[PDB]
Scaffold this active site. Sequence first.
Site, short mmCIF file in Angstrom:
data_model
loop_
_atom_site.label_atom_id
_atom_site.label_comp_id
_atom_site.label_asym_id
_atom_site.label_seq_id
_atom_site.Cartn_x
_atom_site.Cartn_y
_atom_site.Cartn_z
N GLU A 285 -64.30 -17.53 -3.84
CA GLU A 285 -63.93 -16.60 -2.77
C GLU A 285 -64.33 -17.20 -1.42
OE1 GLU A 285 -64.44 -11.83 -1.74
OE2 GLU A 285 -66.20 -13.13 -1.92
N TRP B 66 -59.40 -10.09 -5.90
CA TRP B 66 -58.60 -9.52 -4.83
C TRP B 66 -57.14 -9.22 -5.17
CZ3 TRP B 66 -60.52 -7.17 -0.83
CH2 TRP B 66 -61.71 -7.61 -0.22
N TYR C 48 -60.71 -11.38 6.31
CA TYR C 48 -61.75 -12.40 6.40
C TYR C 48 -61.36 -13.81 6.84
CZ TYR C 48 -64.54 -8.82 4.08
OH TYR C 48 -65.19 -7.65 3.75
N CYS D 25 -65.34 -5.09 4.77
CA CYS D 25 -66.55 -4.36 4.44
C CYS D 25 -67.69 -5.05 5.19
CB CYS D 25 -66.79 -4.38 2.92
SG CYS D 25 -65.44 -3.56 2.02
N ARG E 144 -70.74 -2.78 6.85
CA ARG E 144 -70.42 -1.39 7.21
C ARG E 144 -70.28 -0.47 6.02
NH1 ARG E 144 -65.67 0.37 5.53
NH2 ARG E 144 -64.06 -1.20 5.06
N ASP F 63 -70.38 -1.16 -1.78
CA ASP F 63 -70.30 -0.62 -3.13
C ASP F 63 -71.50 -1.31 -3.77
OD1 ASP F 63 -67.67 -0.44 -5.67
OD2 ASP F 63 -69.84 -0.29 -5.87
#
Lengths: 288, 288
Positions: free
Chosen positions: A62, A84, A110, A170, A190, A193
């Site tokens: 990633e 994703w 991103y 996120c 922000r 999970d």
Amino acid sequence: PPHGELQYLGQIQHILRCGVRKDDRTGTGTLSVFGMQARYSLRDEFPLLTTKRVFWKGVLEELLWFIKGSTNAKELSSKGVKIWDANGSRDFLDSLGFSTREEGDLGPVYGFQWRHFGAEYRDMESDYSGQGVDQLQRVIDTIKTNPDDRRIIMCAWNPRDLPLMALPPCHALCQFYVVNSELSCQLYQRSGDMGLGVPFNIASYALLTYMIAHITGLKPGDFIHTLGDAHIYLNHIEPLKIQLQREPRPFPKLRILRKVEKIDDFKAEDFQIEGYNPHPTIKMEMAV
Amino acid sequence: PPHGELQYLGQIQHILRCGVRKDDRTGTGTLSVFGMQARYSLRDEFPLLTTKRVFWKGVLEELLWFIKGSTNAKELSSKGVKIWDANGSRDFLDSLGFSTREEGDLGPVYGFQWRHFGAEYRDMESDYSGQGVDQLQRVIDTIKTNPDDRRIIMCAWNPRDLPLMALPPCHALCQFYVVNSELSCQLYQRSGDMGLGVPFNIASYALLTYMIAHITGLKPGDFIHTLGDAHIYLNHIEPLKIQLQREPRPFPKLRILRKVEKIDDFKAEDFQIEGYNPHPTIKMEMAV
Ligand SMILES: Cc1nc(=O)c2cc(CN(C)c3ccc(C(=O)N[C@@H](CCC(=O)O)C(=O)O)s3)ccc2[nH]1
Ligand SMILES: Cc1nc(=O)c2cc(CN(C)c3ccc(C(=O)N[C@@H](CCC(=O)O)C(=O)O)s3)ccc2[nH]1
Ligand SMILES: *c1cc(=O)[nH]c(=O)n1[C@H]1C[C@H](O)[C@@H](COP(=O)(O)O)O1
Ligand SMILES: *c1cc(=O)[nH]c(=O)n1[C@H]1C[C@H](O)[C@@H](COP(=O)(O)O)O1
């Protein structure tokens, strides 16, 4: 000193015991706490949770994927990492009004923000070379020329691009810090999970710091994880209670097998995780 | 019932004790620590520090000034608050290569980013009506309609505008959160002059939260202060040591003297700090 992983376990304990029931976008419902922070040492150890086997291959691919500036879930999926793919689905893209968008196009997320912030987004196939602000390289360069700089920030949160995203970041931004040849990084997440993304996200930024320290000739210092809406999905409560009964094990170490000059030069084979002895994997069902 | 101010005082202690010497842009020198977090309750109390008298008028006036969307130091100076005059002076502007800019023009700062994020900045007098993203109003609108939203963020850090700012924002961004009818706010301050700016900053955001809570019909919850480079300048160590010897007094309360409908409607006379009994003022020389 105490095991750095206890901080994460402690955050899980807190949310489960004192978190407030808060509905959410997915409709799954959560236990939430606003505002949390943890400090993970990166000195001679790597913060890859042990109370559960973390999908390290996913983390590494990633990040490399992000570094390339890719926004196509297909390219990461071709590496065997499907994390994703759901978000790039035909059905999912349509539910957001992205019917004309090709499958796998996650929008200006991103990778695009880190390397081309402010550039006019077209699609995942477009060539943005030379467009926008290459924050990643600016951060690397600043660390080299002026390590005292208190403005070393890479921001993924772009207000004008949020509408085009299949999911706003996120991770709004991260900040780097240098003192006595040691490189530290703080992430402002922000939304987190706790049972799924977080352990992953922690390893991810700890890795990015190692990579940047490597090419800047610095030693990894600390990774500070700051959370906004720290939440545990209702369906993760039981698996997380099982994970909490597990005693952490010494964190593994991360070895960079080759001398790398540029951030874009790193490759999956350049990294090696050793001494990683995690408890059995625990499945956390995705929320949607 | 641990007094809320003990967090700020504890952060000062920590930095004086564990902070590391770190040169800085101003050439003054600092004791530094990367990554800190403090939670200040806003429930039936306002976190205006008492171990020293905080310039509340400056706090209130500066925020009203931000809301107006002003980037002109003179507009704040005319209120009797001179905190941004130096950064808007001819000499300081010229030193950064802004000789073509008028004195008082701080560039695309808070006022601009908060109400016109993304717009192309011309000068402090330009009319930006309808240009850019009015993040402030959007934040207010979301709080009033979808309180569970985990993306209520107001960003001041704009990679594209940095090369025009007289001073990149020390307050990169803030995130709002709602649960049980309580509005909370977390600030990500990339750089914190613990002796000078921080006390003032903490009051600034607590006030913003009180304002938004008021116009959205919610009660103030928590203000989470998150710091990147938390530093004590060297010429502040002596006065801070004296401040640390002072026992905090119960925090005052903030009263809004009338029902206000819109954020732009707030006037200085609409606020009253009551029960504020601080220890004597402590001057903290400005660094540079
Ligand atoms: C509600 C929600 N929570 C998330 O954590 C989340 C994460 C991503 C993307 N992401 C950044 C991810 C990181 C790790 C992932 C994951 O599914 N990990 C599994 C591995 C299972 C496997 O693929 O073999 C795990 O860690 O158990 S997914 C996208 C949408 C989301 N949506
Ligand atoms: C090195 C440095 N530190 C700062 O805290 C700082 C702050 C601002 C702007 N700002 C956001 C400020 C908030 C509060 C301020 C201040 O000077 N406060 C004095 C008040 C003296 C008075 O009454 O006029 C104080 O609190 O002692 S200045 C600009 C450059 C800076 N530069
Ligand atoms: C997003 C992406 C990531 O890298 N890691 C995460 O933890 N997440 C999580 C947070 C949240 O549960 C969800 C995103 O939803 P929202 O935008 O906050 O509503 O994924
Ligand atoms: C900036 C502005 C503010 O409102 N609060 C602050 O504490 N500061 C401080 C931080 C730092 O000492 C200095 C800004 O310098 P730099 O850009 O971080 O180099 O003022």
